[PDB]
Design an enzyme around this catalytic site. Structure first.
Site, mmCIF file in Angstrom:
data_model
loop_
_atom_site.group_PDB
_atom_site.id
_atom_site.type_symbol
_atom_site.label_atom_id
_atom_site.label_comp_id
_atom_site.label_asym_id
_atom_site.label_seq_id
_atom_site.Cartn_x
_atom_site.Cartn_y
_atom_site.Cartn_z
ATOM 1 N N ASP A 54 0.799 -1.214 0.000
ATOM 2 C CA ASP A 54 0.000 0.000 0.000
ATOM 3 C C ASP A 54 0.834 1.267 0.000
ATOM 4 O O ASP A 54 0.248 2.321 0.194
ATOM 5 C CB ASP A 54 -0.970 -0.001 1.227
ATOM 6 N N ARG A 69 0.810 6.853 0.176
ATOM 7 C CA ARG A 69 0.191 5.797 0.919
ATOM 8 C C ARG A 69 -1.224 5.743 0.341
ATOM 9 O O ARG A 69 -1.901 6.773 0.170
ATOM 10 C CB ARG A 69 0.181 6.165 2.405
ATOM 11 N N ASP A 72 -5.515 -1.283 4.020
ATOM 12 C CA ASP A 72 -4.345 -1.679 4.764
ATOM 13 C C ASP A 72 -3.896 -3.021 4.234
ATOM 14 O O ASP A 72 -4.714 -3.946 4.260
ATOM 15 C CB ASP A 72 -4.686 -1.794 6.235
ATOM 16 N N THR A 73 -2.666 -3.148 3.718
ATOM 17 C CA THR A 73 -2.203 -4.438 3.225
ATOM 18 C C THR A 73 -1.408 -5.102 4.339
ATOM 19 O O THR A 73 -0.893 -4.352 5.181
ATOM 20 C CB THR A 73 -1.280 -4.345 1.955
ATOM 21 N N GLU A 110 1.709 -6.535 6.436
ATOM 22 C CA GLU A 110 3.025 -5.988 6.572
ATOM 23 C C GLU A 110 4.104 -6.896 6.024
ATOM 24 O O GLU A 110 3.981 -8.117 6.067
ATOM 25 C CB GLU A 110 3.206 -5.715 8.050
ATOM 26 N N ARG A 113 3.586 11.479 3.886
ATOM 27 C CA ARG A 113 3.247 10.666 2.719
ATOM 28 C C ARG A 113 2.015 11.268 2.033
ATOM 29 O O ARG A 113 1.063 11.699 2.705
ATOM 30 C CB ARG A 113 2.909 9.253 3.125
HETATM 31 C C1 LIG Z 1 -3.952 5.438 5.240
HETATM 32 C C2 LIG Z 1 -3.659 6.439 6.375
HETATM 33 C C3 LIG Z 1 -2.777 6.138 7.341
HETATM 34 N N1 LIG Z 1 -2.454 7.044 8.323
HETATM 35 C C4 LIG Z 1 -1.575 6.714 9.462
HETATM 36 C C5 LIG Z 1 -2.361 5.935 10.493
HETATM 37 C C6 LIG Z 1 -1.238 5.115 11.088
HETATM 38 O O1 LIG Z 1 -0.451 5.862 12.017
HETATM 39 P P1 LIG Z 1 0.600 5.128 13.020
HETATM 40 O O2 LIG Z 1 1.820 4.678 12.302
HETATM 41 O O3 LIG Z 1 0.658 6.056 14.164
HETATM 42 O O4 LIG Z 1 -0.180 3.821 13.482
HETATM 43 C C7 LIG Z 1 -0.315 4.782 9.939
HETATM 44 C C8 LIG Z 1 -0.677 3.513 9.184
HETATM 45 O O5 LIG Z 1 0.205 3.434 8.071
HETATM 46 P P2 LIG Z 1 0.834 2.067 7.563
HETATM 47 O O6 LIG Z 1 -0.268 1.079 7.442
HETATM 48 O O7 LIG Z 1 1.634 2.429 6.357
HETATM 49 O O8 LIG Z 1 1.756 1.611 8.742
HETATM 50 O O9 LIG Z 1 -0.482 5.881 9.047
HETATM 51 C C9 LIG Z 1 -3.011 8.296 8.338
HETATM 52 O O10 LIG Z 1 -2.659 9.181 9.114
HETATM 53 N N2 LIG Z 1 -3.916 8.565 7.355
HETATM 54 C C10 LIG Z 1 -4.307 7.720 6.354
HETATM 55 O O11 LIG Z 1 -5.186 8.082 5.570
HETATM 56 CO CO LIG Z 2 0.049 -1.612 5.790
#
Ligand SMILES: Cc1cn([C@H]2C[C@H](OP(=O)(O)O)[C@@H](COP(=O)(O)O)O2)c(=O)[nH]c1=O
Ligand SMILES: [Co+2]
Length: 136
Positions: free
Chosen positions: A16, A30, A35-36, A38, A82
């Site tokens: 993702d 992103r 959510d894919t 890890e 991102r």
């Molecule tokens: C998809 C997305 C993720 N995020 C944040 C939530 C999560 O924060 P934390 O890292 O604090 O948990 C993280 C998940 O991303 P990843 O799934 O790439 O890890 O990115 C956002 O802020 N907005 C979004 O729209």
């Molecule tokens: Co992910």
């Protein structure tokens, strides 16, 4: 409404997250609303179907003739810097293609960035009733 803009692939990172050249700048993007599993982080780690979700996104963007990004109507970047977008590879939305294959679940739904949420939930319900990958 939303509009698609051109972008150029630099590198796919995993299921993702992909790096793109957007308006002349390198950014990591992103994928909105999904959510894919890890491949990376030790407080998550190589999860079942993570290798296959990464390879599916990699295949889909590397073989495309045209990549487009579509921002939603709220913020365009998250707290990590991102870009937050729907990514299209020759007009097919990568975020929906993953969910339709059971390689991602609909997640991180933060209003107002949720224009395609019902479309994605409809595809996720179909992947679950077909018992695909995550759902098998
Ligand atoms: C998809 C997305 C993720 N995020 C944040 C939530 C999560 O924060 P934390 O890292 O604090 O948990 C993280 C998940 O991303 P990843 O799934 O790439 O890890 O990115 C956002 O802020 N907005 C979004 O729209
Ligand atoms: Co992910």
């Amino acid at each position: 409404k939303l509009h698609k803009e051109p972008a150029t692939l630099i590198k796919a990172i995993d299921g993702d997250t992909v790096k793109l050249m957007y308006k002349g700048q390198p950014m990591t993007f992103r994928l909105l609303l999904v959510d894919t599993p890890e491949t990376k982080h030790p407080k998550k780690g190589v999860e079942k179907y993570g290798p296959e979700a990464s390879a599916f996104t990699k295949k889909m963007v590397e073989n495309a003739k045209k990549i487009e990004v579509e921002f939603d109507k709220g913020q365009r970047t998250d707290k990590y810097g991102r870009g937050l977008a729907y990514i299209y590879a020759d007009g097919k939305m990568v975020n929906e293609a993953l969910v339709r294959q059971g390689l991602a679940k609909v997640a991180y739904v933060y209003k107002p960035n949720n224009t395609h949420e019902q479309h994605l939930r409809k595809s996720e319900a179909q992947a679950k009733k077909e018992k695909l990958n995550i759902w098998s």
